[PDB]
């Protein structure tokens, strides 16, 4: 969230020489996730993040191809949002590689993962109430 991004910025300020990789992931990301949107917190905190050159912005939480990450690489994803271009320094693909050949996931689990059709970003919030795209939210211990 914003407080976490502020803490990361404070750590980068305390150690300007040491490289810090801010791996931003919205609530739409797989596994454990927060309630924050993937886009708006970046729109708020990008200027502060880039105020420190030693922070690398890595964008995950809902990426599985080059087509949907290229706008984030070039930064033109923000042009539709009435913002200037916002290039990102990298990406992380968590759920996209869950059905890779070398992952220890079982064949039936891989078939189930592939069977999950997914859901666009604007409808990711509809997982705390009912399943959408084959994925639903649950609560941990």
């Amino acid at each position: 969230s914003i407080d976490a991004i502020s803490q990361v910025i404070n750590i980068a300020k305390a150690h300007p020489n040491f490289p810090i990789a801010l791996q931003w992931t919205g609530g739409r990301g797989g596994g454990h996730h927060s309630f924050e949107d993937a886009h708006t917190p970046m729109l708020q905190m990008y200027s502060k993040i880039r105020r420190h050159p030693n922070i690398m912005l890595i964008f995950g939480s809902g990426f599985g191809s080059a087509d949907d990450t290229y706008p984030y690489l070039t930064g033109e994803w923000s042009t539709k949002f009435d913002y200037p271009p916002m290039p990102f320094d990298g990406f992380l693909f968590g759920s996209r590689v869950m059905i890779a050949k070398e992952v220890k996931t079982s064949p039936d689990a891989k078939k189930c993962i592939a069977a999950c059709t997914g859901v666009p970003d604007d409808k990711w919030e509809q997982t705390y109430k009912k399943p959408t795209g084959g994925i639903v939210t649950v609560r941990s211990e």
């Binding site: 609530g27 880039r50 009435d82 200037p84 271009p85 919030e125």
Partner: protein
């Protein structure tokens, strides 16, 4: 008596009288012209030379008069002519606007409610931040529908995507503030555990230090009086005499190419039409020089926030201070000769290309 007030601060008028528009308009113009004079003299440029070096000029509502006056300036001799025209225009618009819609004392019940609910003194202009134009316009539409035709409110300054100002009667703006408070979540609310879609939208509204409802229907009848009296005062701006582009506050078009009277357009901009600052800020420039009042709270920092990340530096000439973030300049950066003076704000598209 500006000279007496300056010489003897003890017997200066009270802040409300000073903030009243018949004082505030000409005095703010004089302040902007003083900043321009200080800059030009300390740098050794004549006003005409400094203006020629400027790629463009503009202003937020009132500052358009000063911008066009600076564009008018040619030399130190005619600089007083330009100053006279600017002060005359500002004085007349202030006087006529005050006569059209003079301020009145509001109920102490309303004042007490506003102060008790962590709100400023009601004023004819209310700035709303962190709310989009569609939402602010919807609230204004509800308030107008439930108010009579004479007391309607409308958006005056479109400062940004999430920064607007509504102008109108202080009573109407207080009612709009009540509606916004009803629709506003507590500032000290923790919403981290609620989904983003289901989160209540939080925003900040505050009454600006203004004494009349600028860019409102209430000041419409003063427009004709101003137009008929500026010709009597012999104050007019000519496109040919203007030699740098000046961006109209409403649509951002250059005032030189306007078929109609530039003075009339400026008056209509200040009193009737809204200020679409984003639309006017479409000019391509690397550095912006803010001569307005407020310094860090002035127009320069707001423009910097609007244009952040586009590689456009903003330097405020109204005060001498240091910015720890260093994301906008100050008066020293204008006169610095070393590389510290030349600061280019980061361009995310190019820097992180």
């Amino acid at each position: 008596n500006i000279l007496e007030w300056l010489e003897n601060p003890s017997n200066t008028p009270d802040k409300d009288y000073l903030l009243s528009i018949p004082i505030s308009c000409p005095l703010i113009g004089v302040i902007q012209l003083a900043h321009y004079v200080v800059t030009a003299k300390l740098l050794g440029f004549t006003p005409g030379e400094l203006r020629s070096y400027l790629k463009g000029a503009t202003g937020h509502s009132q500052g358009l008069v000063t911008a066009v006056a600076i564009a008018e300036t040619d030399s130190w001799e005619s600089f007083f002519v330009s100053v006279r025209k600017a002060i005359t225009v500002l004085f007349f618009i202030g006087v006529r606007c005050y006569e059209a819609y003079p301020n009145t004392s509001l109920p102490p019940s309303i004042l007490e409610d506003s102060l008790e609910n962590n709100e400023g003194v009601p004023s004819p202009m209310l700035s709303i931040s962190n709310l989009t134009q569609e939402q602010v316009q919807d609230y204004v539409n509800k308030t107008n529908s439930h108010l009579p035709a004479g007391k309607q409110v409308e958006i005056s300054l479109v400062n940004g995507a999430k920064n607007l100002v509504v102008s109108g009667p202080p009573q109407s703006l207080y009612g709009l503030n009540l509606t916004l408070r009803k629709a506003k979540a507590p500032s000290g609310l923790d919403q981290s555990r609620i989904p983003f879609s289901e989160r209540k939208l939080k925003f900040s509204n505050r009454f600006l230090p203004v004494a009349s409802p600028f860019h409102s229907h209430l000041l419409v009848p003063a427009s004709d009086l101003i137009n008929k009296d500026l010709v009597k005062n012999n104050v007019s701006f000519n496109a040919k005499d203007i030699q740098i582009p000046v961006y109209d506050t409403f649509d951002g078009s250059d005032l030189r190419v306007l078929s109609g009277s530039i003075s009339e357009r400026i008056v209509d901009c200040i009193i009737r039409l809204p200020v679409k600052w984003e639309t006017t800020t479409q000019f391509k420039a690397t550095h912006i020089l803010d001569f307005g009042p407020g310094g860090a709270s002035g127009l320069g920092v707001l423009t910097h926030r609007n244009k952040d990340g586009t590689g456009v530096r903003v330097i405020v000439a109204g005060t001498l201070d240091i910015n720890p973030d260093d994301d906008y300049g100050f008066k020293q950066e204008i006169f610095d000769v070393t590389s510290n003076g030349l600061k280019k704000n980061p361009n995310w598209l190019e820097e992180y290309h």
